[PDB]
Structure formats: structure tokens, C-alpha cells
Amino acid sequence: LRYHSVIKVSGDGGVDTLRAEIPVDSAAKELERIQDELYKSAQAVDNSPET
Amino acid sequence: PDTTMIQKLIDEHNPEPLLKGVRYYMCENDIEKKRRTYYDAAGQQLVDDTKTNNRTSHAWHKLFVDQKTQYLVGEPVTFTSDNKTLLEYVNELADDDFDDILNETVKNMSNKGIEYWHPFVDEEGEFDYVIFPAEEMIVVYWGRVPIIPFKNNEEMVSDLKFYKDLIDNYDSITSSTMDSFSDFQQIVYVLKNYDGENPKEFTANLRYHSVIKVSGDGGVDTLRAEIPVDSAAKELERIQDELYKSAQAVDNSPETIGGGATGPALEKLYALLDLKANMAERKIRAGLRLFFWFFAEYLRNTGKGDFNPDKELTMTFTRTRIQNDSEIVQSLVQGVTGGIMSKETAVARNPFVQDPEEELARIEEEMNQY
Amino acid sequence: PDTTMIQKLIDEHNPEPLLKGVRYYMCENDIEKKRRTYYDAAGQQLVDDTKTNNRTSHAWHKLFVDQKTQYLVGEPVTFTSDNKTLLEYVNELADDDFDDILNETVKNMSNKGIEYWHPFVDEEGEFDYVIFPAEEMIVVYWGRVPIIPFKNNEEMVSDLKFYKDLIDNYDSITSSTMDSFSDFQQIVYVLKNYDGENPKEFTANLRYHSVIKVSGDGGVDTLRAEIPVDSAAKELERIQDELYKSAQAVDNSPETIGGGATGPALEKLYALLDLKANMAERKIRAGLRLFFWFFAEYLRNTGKGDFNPDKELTMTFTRTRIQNDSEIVQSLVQGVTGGIMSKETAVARNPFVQDPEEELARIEEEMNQY
Ligand SMILES: [Ca+2]
Ligand SMILES: [Ca+2]
Ligand SMILES: [Hg+2]
Ligand SMILES: [Hg+2]
């Protein structure tokens, strides 16, 4: 596999791959609220630009 | 003094904390240590020549430091006193080569966390000053000790200290994604119930003819790398915004929102860097006052007069700040017309004016003609 | 001096660090070394004539360097002093060929990290100066040493240093994507339970007739390359934006957003470059002052007078900056009408005025007629 492109399989088998799921969306969604609270809880000013 | 304690001080000294910021300013980030590994027979961790090992280090820190330096010291420092002889000597010393050095000092103090520079009398007998790289200096506590500290913070850490986590993350992600782009090229074939007995036949038969021969009920599946561009891009965006925050910098990327032109909108934009500039000024002035104390000592002893800088001399920093000159001019014209303002104050506050003295004088001579 | 030390110095010298920026300026990027390899019988890594090996190398660096050069030095440098004899001699020396060389110096100091140039008296006895390529020079430390350093930074690295990682990544992606487009053409067939016994029959039967014959319960699957245009495009986007930041450049692609016209919107656009220009100016001036010291030495000894450039002569750099001339003219008009401004200052601030002296006079002589 590391020196040629090949994995050889017989029978009726095969190769499945397992890859990590990256939770970017849920995380970004949560991180958004926390950031808003952060500024409140801390009594701070957010001078990000106003949409 | 002792020669043995010297060796202890040298061998106990380490420049790795102070060089940290310098290495990042040069795009030598910890990510350059990234290597793509794998495990041998009996689990011996080993780099593998098979795969490209991209390691992208970002110039964020160099950007932020430069921005800070130029903001505080880009425009040369101005000096004012009532003692004119002193004023002359100070100006003679400090208004051209001084500027270019103070610039190198602020960048240096931001990379190292501290910058020392040393005053000394030239072989020609004149006063001189040279930068004394803090990563070569060792300190434990003319009359006073003969070196001048410029402190970046109280903590004398590099600016990098408060956002190095983010730059590293940013780098980690980018390079990961880069590897994915590289790996996407190298297709992996899964050969189910393969027809040929010979291994040679495959690699030649695919590479030189379009064909892969398969019998039984099998076939050929391909495994291609997935490239996480989307998720990477989504996260990177946040890290990018936080980076500016964490570093107290200004982002003059263009504003999607159609407001960014107005006075407040601009003031808000610079808010954080203005925060970071003020500290750094306080800390810069501290160092510089001490610098002029030494110059005063030199003048006392060289017989050119006895002076008190700390009470006679005043320093003026200038800030390169984006304004809405169109808005201001109008506010000012309204102000004066309204009569809530003197033309004097107005002319000095006018963005198209460099020296209020000359212009106030120019406007009067105009009137005395017309 | 010693001839053996000479050899050491030469053999220990390496130009690769200094030629780096010159190679990228000429679009010989590291990507030109990319080659499409594969593995032999006993794992011998080998280039493979089968596949096209696109390696596209991007002119990004040359663009930025060109932009910096022109911004600083595109307009010729102006000199002022009260000593008119000196002023004459300086102008005679430095206002046409000197412009064209100083341009080539800035470009060079940004590719190499430094540029040296050597002053020398001509065979005709006149003062002369030639560029002394820094990659041919070796330095360890008239009266002073006889060569003039133009430093790019303090670190005397090329500008490429702070964004080479990105350029490379940009090249890497584009080329990979090109390979994908190339590979897409060559369709690979997977032949399940193939009908023909003859291998010849297939390649001709497909090539000359539309047909592939299959028996059993098999068939023909095709394997086509995937082209990662989308993901690539998305990453390439970010890199490009970063590229402009990391390099402290101006990007005047047209603004999707309808703000870009205003004063502050344009100021923001040049913000980073204005940063980069200010350092570079300081560093250029430093080299140039020393150049006029040598010219002064020549003048002292040639019997054309003794001068002090460092204190008598003043230099003026000009910057080609995009403005909103329509907006400025209004604000100025408003300022003068309002009374917060002298017509003098205003005339000098007017974007349609080259020489304030001539125009302030022209306006007077207009009035004395009207
Ligand atoms: Ca790298
Ligand atoms: Ca090429
Ligand atoms: Hg952090
Ligand atoms: Hg970089």
C-alpha cells in the first residue's frame, strides 16, 4: 500500500475506510453563543463591525 | 568579580524564550518541526519518504508587530522644552538615525519581550548609543547601571505570547489540508478477485494500457483521499478573527457592510490597537526618559551645561490614524459657524494641516490682503 | 592580505540564500523541481514517462516587488538644501541615470535581502558609481570601507522570506489540479469476465470500432480521474488573500462592495503597503546618506568645496497613491470657505497641482488682472 497503489483482496471481501468526523459546524455554532455570553458575563465592549 | 559565577550565569542563561518571537517574525514556526511518521515492525516510529510533508508557517506575527511598530514610531518623535539650548542638543542627537533605530527597538522589544540598548562615549569623544540585543544580556540587581531597558510589557514577554496558540493552530490546519491536496493525487486501488497471477502484469498493464483485467465476480474499487477544505475553511475563518482580537491589531480588509467610512466606524476599527499602543507608549517613554537622563549626565560632564530632562523636556508621539477628513472638515466648519469653536482650535484640528503655527499665520496675511 | 583565506572565504560563501528571491522574481519557483514518480520492482523511486508533469510557478513575488519598487522610487528623489552650490552638484549627479539605477537597487534589495553599490573615480577623473551585486560580495568588520550597503531589512532577508511558504502552496495546488485535468483524458477500463481470448483484439476493436465484446454476466466499468477544481478553488482563494497580507501589498482588483471610492476606503487599501514603504524608506535613506558622504569626500578632494550632506542636504520621496481628487477638492474648498484654512496650504494640498510655488503665483497674477 505504501509503495504501490494496491491492496489485494479475495473472497467476497473488500476494504472499508474509517475516517474521523470533524465537528466544525456544531462547534462553530456553539462557540458563537459562548463568545456572545463571554462579552456579557465579562461586562466588556465588542467593537466588531456592526452587520 | 568572579570568573566562575560568570560561567554559571552563562550556562544557566537561555535565549529560547526571547528568540521565540524572533523566529515567528521570520516565519520559522514550530510547525517547521512537523514530520509525517509511521510505525515499523516492532513499533519504531519512523518518518516516511512516501508522503510529502508540507509545513506552512504563517507571517501573522510579523504583520502584527510591524503594524504596532509603525503606529507608535513610524512618525518620528517630537520634543518640546522651554530650555532652548537643551532643545538644540536633543534635536541634533535625535531626529534621523535615532528614528530608524527606535523603530528597530520597538520591533525588537515586541519580538523579544525586552530590548536593551547601551550608551557610550565615542573614540572621537562624542556621545553615542548602540543596540544591545537582550538575548545576549544578563541582568541582576555614571552613578547608575550603564544600560537602558525598553520593556514590552511588565511581564517582559513577547507579544507572540498571547496568540502563539492561534498561529500554531492556523499553521496546523493549513498544512494538514495541504497534505490532503498532495495525497489526493495518489489513488489507491482495491483489487477484488483479480484475474492475473503475475504482479508484474498489473503495474505495466495499467500504466501503459488503459486496462485492468478482472475475473470472477470482483472488480476494482478506488480509495481516494478526502480533502477537508470546507471544514478547514470554516474554522480558519474564526481563528483568523480571533487572531486579530487576541493580538490587538487592525484589520483593514474591506468592509462588506456599508458603514465603515464614518467617524465611529473608524474609531471602532482601531480600538484594540489603540489599546495596545498606549501601553507600549508608556513603556517606551519610560526607557526613553532614562535615555535622556544619560544624555544629561554626558552634557554635565562634557561641560555643555547642567539640565533636568525629567522636568524640562517633553516628548510627543504621533499616530498614523485613518480618518474621514471629509467628515471632520465639515464638523469643524459647522462648529466654527455655530460659534462653539475658535478658528485657532479649528485650524489645529484640520486634517489638511501640518503646522498650526504657519497656517494660522498664513490665513491672517491672506485677510490683510483681501 | 592572504590568498589562502581568500579561498576559504570564497568556498565558505554561498549565494543560494541571496539568489532565492531572484529565482522567484523570474518564476523559477521550487515547484519547477516537482516530478511524477512511482516505484520499481524492489522499491526504486523513478520518474514515469506515462504522465504529464505540470509544474506552474506563480509570478506573485515579482508583482509585489515591482509594486514596492515603483511606490518608493518610481518618482525620482528630490533634494533640498540652503547651500546652493552643493544643491547644483547633487542634481547634476543624480536626477536621470541615478533614478534608473536606484529603481534597480530597490528591486534587487528585495530579491536578495541586501544590495551593495560601489563609488569610484572614472578614468576621465569624474565621480562614478556602479552596482556591486551582493551575491558576489563578502563582508567582514576614503577613510571608511569603500562600499555602500542598501539593506532590505535589519535581517537582510529577501521579502520572499515572509511569504514563500504561501507562493509554494499556491504553486503546489495549481499544478496538482493541472495534473488532474491532464489525467482525466486517459480513461482506464475495468474488464469484468472479458469475452475475447486475444489481447490484440481489444485494443484494436475499441480503437477502430465502437465495440467492446463481453460474455458471462460481466461488463465494462470505466475509471476516470476526479478533478478537485472546487476544493482547490476554495483554498486558493484564502491563500491569495493571505498572500496579499503576508506580503504587505495592495490589491486593486475591483470592489464587489460599493464603498471603495471614499477617502478612508482608499486609505485602508494602501494601509499595509504604506507600512512596508516606510521601513524600506528608512533603510534606503540610510544607504543614500552614506552615498552622499562619499560624494562629499570626492568634492573635498577634487577641490570643488567642503560640504556636510548629513546636515545641509534634505531628501524628498514621493508616493504614487490613489486618491479621490473630487472629494479632496471639495473638502479643501469647504475648508477655505469655512476659514479653517489658508489658500496657500490648500493650493499645496490640491491634487491638480504639481508645483505650489508656480500656482500660488499664477492665482495672484490672475487676480491683478481681474
Ligand atoms: Ca515551510
Ligand atoms: Ca513551469
Ligand atoms: Hg493564546
Ligand atoms: Hg510565511
Side-chain angles (χ1 to χ4, degrees), chain A residues 1-4 6-7 9-51, chain B residues 1-22 24-48 50-121 125-140 142-143 146-191 194-196 199 202-209 211-212 214-299 301-311 313-353 356 361, chain C residues 1-22 24-48 50-121 125-140 142-143 146-191 194-196 199 202-209 211-212 214-299 301-311 313-353 356 361:
Chain A
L1 162 80
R2 209 165 132 271
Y3 287 109
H4 305 277
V6 206
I7 293 170
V9 157
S10 63
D12 290 293
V15 187
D16 292 291
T17 61
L18 303 179
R19 226 165 169 119
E21 206 191 303
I22 309 173
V24 163
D25 278 321
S26 346
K29 172 141 215 182
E30 191 68 322
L31 279 177
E32 184 160 25
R33 176 190 48 80
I34 295 155
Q35 208 222 55
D36 161 86
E37 291 156 2
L38 222 24
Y39 274 98
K40 276 183 183 176
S41 290
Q43 273 136 250
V45 151
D46 187 342
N47 25 212
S48 294
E50 201 21 78
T51 334
Chain B
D2 215 301
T3 311
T4 312
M5 120 233 169
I6 275 176
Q7 183 63 3
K8 267 180 208 168
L9 289 174
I10 285 179
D11 293 12
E12 164 229 297
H13 183 85
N14 64 322
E16 64 162 310
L18 307 188
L19 282 174
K20 212 101 272 296
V22 181
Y24 272 66
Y25 190 98
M26 302 290 287
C27 303
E28 331 269 32
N29 309 5
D30 294 5
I31 202 219
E32 304 295 351
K33 308 174 214 305
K34 172 183 170 282
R35 296 285 206 78
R36 291 180 78 181
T37 95
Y38 89 111
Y39 290 87
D40 215 59
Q44 192 143 41
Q45 185 159 192
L46 222 157
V47 158
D48 82 309
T50 286
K51 304 174 145 73
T52 334
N53 170 68
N54 174 267
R55 59 242 174 268
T56 310
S57 44
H58 292 265
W60 286 125
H61 178 62
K62 159 156 162 62
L63 200 81
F64 300 137
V65 171
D66 269 357
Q67 192 181 44
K68 151 148 89 161
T69 314
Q70 171 75 182
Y71 195 58
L72 296 155
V73 178
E75 288 303 301
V77 195
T78 306
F79 310 92
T80 323
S81 78
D82 294 53
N83 192 352
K84 256 56 196 184
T85 317
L86 166 70
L87 193 67
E88 284 171 34
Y89 275 111
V90 167
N91 277 294
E92 154 80 272
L93 156 76
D95 224 48
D96 214 291
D97 283 312
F98 173 80
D99 312 355
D100 319 316
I101 294 306
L102 186 60
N103 255 289
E104 291 293 345
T105 297
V106 183
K107 162 209 190 176
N108 274 213
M109 97 178 71
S110 303
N111 284 143
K112 297 171 194 170
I114 190 151
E115 194 48 68
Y116 297 111
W117 82 19
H118 175 260
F120 73 119
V121 49
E126 283 297 325
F127 187 77
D128 210 336
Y129 51 97
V130 166
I131 204 159
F132 240 62
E135 20 87 31
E136 287 160 343
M137 302 313 287
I138 298 143
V139 164
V140 146
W142 261 295
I147 55 156
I148 312 153
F150 291 98
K151 272 196 272 191
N152 195 37
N153 341 305
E154 197 49 29
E155 299 80 11
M156 315 189 226
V157 275
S158 178
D159 289 67
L160 173 76
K161 169 82 163 141
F162 315 98
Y163 56 78
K164 190 209 181 285
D165 270 351
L166 295 185
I167 295 173
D168 283 334
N169 277 9
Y170 202 98
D171 296 13
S172 310
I173 280 179
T174 326
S175 306
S176 285
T177 294
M178 276 288 154
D179 291 355
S180 280
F181 269 100
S182 228
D183 302 1
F184 186 77
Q185 291 309 311
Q186 270 278 33
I187 305 144
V188 157
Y189 300 91
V190 165
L191 294 178
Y194 173 55
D195 180 76
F202 173 80
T203 352
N205 223 167
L206 161 74
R207 214 163 132 264
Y208 288 106
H209 304 272
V211 201
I212 293 179
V214 155
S215 63
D217 293 296
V220 182
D221 290 291
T222 66
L223 302 184
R224 227 167 172 114
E226 193 188 319
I227 305 169
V229 173
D230 279 324
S231 331
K234 176 137 212 175
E235 192 81 335
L236 274 181
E237 179 156 34
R238 184 183 48 80
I239 297 157
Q240 221 230 35
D241 155 81
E242 292 165 3
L243 214 24
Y244 280 98
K245 268 174 179 183
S246 295
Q248 269 135 260
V250 160
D251 190 349
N252 16 219
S253 303
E255 203 22 86
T256 341
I257 326 303
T262 39
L266 286 172
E267 202 143 332
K268 287 213 261 255
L269 173 80
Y270 273 70
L272 287 189
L273 180 74
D274 266 320
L275 198 81
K276 184 216 270 160
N278 289 27
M279 251 159 283
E281 193 178 316
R282 282 194 292 280
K283 264 55 199 170
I284 281 170
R285 293 174 156 278
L288 222 62
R289 287 194 305 280
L290 186 83
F291 170 86
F292 285 111
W293 164 276
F294 273 63
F295 187 64
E297 286 297 321
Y298 169 84
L299 289 177
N301 310 325
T302 194
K304 289 172 190 175
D306 176 39
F307 309 105
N308 198 324
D310 272 339
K311 295 161 194 176
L313 180 73
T314 86
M315 305 174 202
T316 309
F317 288 75
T318 296
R319 291 193 198 173
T320 50
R321 208 169 160 204
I322 301 178
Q323 290 182 128
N324 194 309
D325 310 5
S326 266
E327 216 179 61
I328 301 169
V329 173
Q330 286 196 320
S331 272
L332 301 186
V333 166
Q334 211 155 196
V336 179
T337 294
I340 343 157
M341 246 207 276
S342 60
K343 275 181 171 75
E344 272 178 3
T345 315
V347 174
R349 279 290 331 176
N350 187 319
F352 295 109
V353 162
Chain C
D2 214 301
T3 307
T4 310
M5 137 226 159
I6 276 177
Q7 187 53 1
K8 259 181 217 164
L9 286 175
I10 287 178
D11 293 13
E12 166 226 292
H13 186 80
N14 68 326
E16 50 162 313
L18 304 194
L19 287 170
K20 208 99 276 291
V22 185
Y24 276 65
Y25 190 97
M26 300 281 292
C27 310
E28 345 267 32
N29 309 5
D30 288 351
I31 203 211
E32 300 290 343
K33 309 174 213 300
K34 167 186 179 284
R35 296 280 209 78
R36 288 176 84 179
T37 104
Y38 84 112
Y39 286 90
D40 212 62
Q44 192 143 33
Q45 183 162 178
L46 222 167
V47 161
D48 85 298
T50 291
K51 304 169 144 65
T52 330
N53 172 68
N54 177 261
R55 60 249 169 257
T56 317
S57 47
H58 292 256
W60 284 127
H61 180 58
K62 166 167 148 48
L63 192 76
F64 303 143
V65 170
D66 259 3
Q67 188 185 50
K68 158 149 80 158
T69 309
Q70 173 71 180
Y71 198 58
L72 289 158
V73 173
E75 287 309 303
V77 195
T78 307
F79 310 96
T80 323
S81 89
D82 294 52
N83 191 358
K84 256 53 197 187
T85 322
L86 167 71
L87 193 67
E88 284 177 26
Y89 273 114
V90 169
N91 276 293
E92 150 87 274
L93 155 70
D95 225 62
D96 219 301
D97 277 306
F98 168 89
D99 310 353
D100 321 317
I101 298 302
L102 184 62
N103 256 282
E104 288 295 345
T105 303
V106 180
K107 161 209 196 171
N108 282 181
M109 101 176 68
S110 307
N111 289 142
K112 299 173 179 164
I114 188 155
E115 192 51 62
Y116 296 110
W117 83 19
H118 175 256
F120 73 118
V121 45
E126 284 294 326
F127 188 74
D128 209 324
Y129 54 98
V130 168
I131 222 153
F132 241 70
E135 16 87 41
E136 285 162 348
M137 299 307 288
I138 296 140
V139 158
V140 144
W142 264 294
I147 60 160
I148 307 156
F150 285 100
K151 272 194 270 184
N152 193 36
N153 333 313
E154 194 57 18
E155 304 88 5
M156 309 182 218
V157 266
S158 170
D159 288 61
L160 173 72
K161 174 76 165 131
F162 314 97
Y163 55 79
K164 194 208 179 281
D165 258 349
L166 300 176
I167 296 177
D168 278 333
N169 278 7
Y170 205 94
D171 299 359
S172 308
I173 281 176
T174 327
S175 297
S176 288
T177 296
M178 272 295 156
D179 292 357
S180 287
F181 268 101
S182 229
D183 305 344
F184 181 77
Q185 294 309 306
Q186 268 279 35
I187 312 141
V188 156
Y189 303 84
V190 169
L191 291 173
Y194 175 53
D195 177 76
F202 174 83
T203 354
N205 218 172
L206 162 75
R207 210 156 141 270
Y208 291 95
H209 305 269
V211 200
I212 295 177
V214 156
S215 69
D217 287 295
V220 188
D221 281 289
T222 60
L223 299 184
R224 230 165 170 119
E226 193 183 318
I227 310 173
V229 170
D230 271 337
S231 332
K234 180 148 217 191
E235 191 75 339
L236 268 188
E237 196 161 7
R238 182 189 47 84
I239 289 161
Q240 220 233 22
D241 160 76
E242 288 164 2
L243 215 25
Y244 275 105
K245 273 158 170 185
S246 298
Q248 270 134 255
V250 167
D251 175 348
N252 26 211
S253 306
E255 203 24 68
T256 346
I257 336 296
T262 40
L266 289 173
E267 202 144 336
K268 287 208 258 256
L269 184 75
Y270 275 78
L272 279 197
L273 183 73
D274 261 313
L275 203 80
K276 185 216 261 157
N278 288 26
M279 247 157 287
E281 187 168 333
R282 281 190 290 277
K283 263 58 208 161
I284 280 167
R285 286 183 168 273
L288 225 64
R289 287 194 302 281
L290 181 88
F291 167 88
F292 284 117
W293 164 276
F294 274 61
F295 188 61
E297 287 300 320
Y298 171 82
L299 287 178
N301 315 325
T302 197
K304 291 170 192 173
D306 172 40
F307 309 104
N308 198 315
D310 268 340
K311 295 158 193 183
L313 185 69
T314 82
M315 303 178 204
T316 307
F317 287 70
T318 290
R319 288 180 203 175
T320 44
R321 206 157 141 224
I322 292 168
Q323 281 190 126
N324 195 313
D325 307 356
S326 237
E327 208 185 61
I328 308 166
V329 165
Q330 291 205 295
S331 286
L332 297 187
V333 151
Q334 206 162 191
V336 178
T337 292
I340 344 162
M341 241 207 283
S342 49
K343 271 177 172 67
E344 271 178 357
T345 320
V347 164
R349 279 296 329 186
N350 189 318
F352 294 108
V353 169

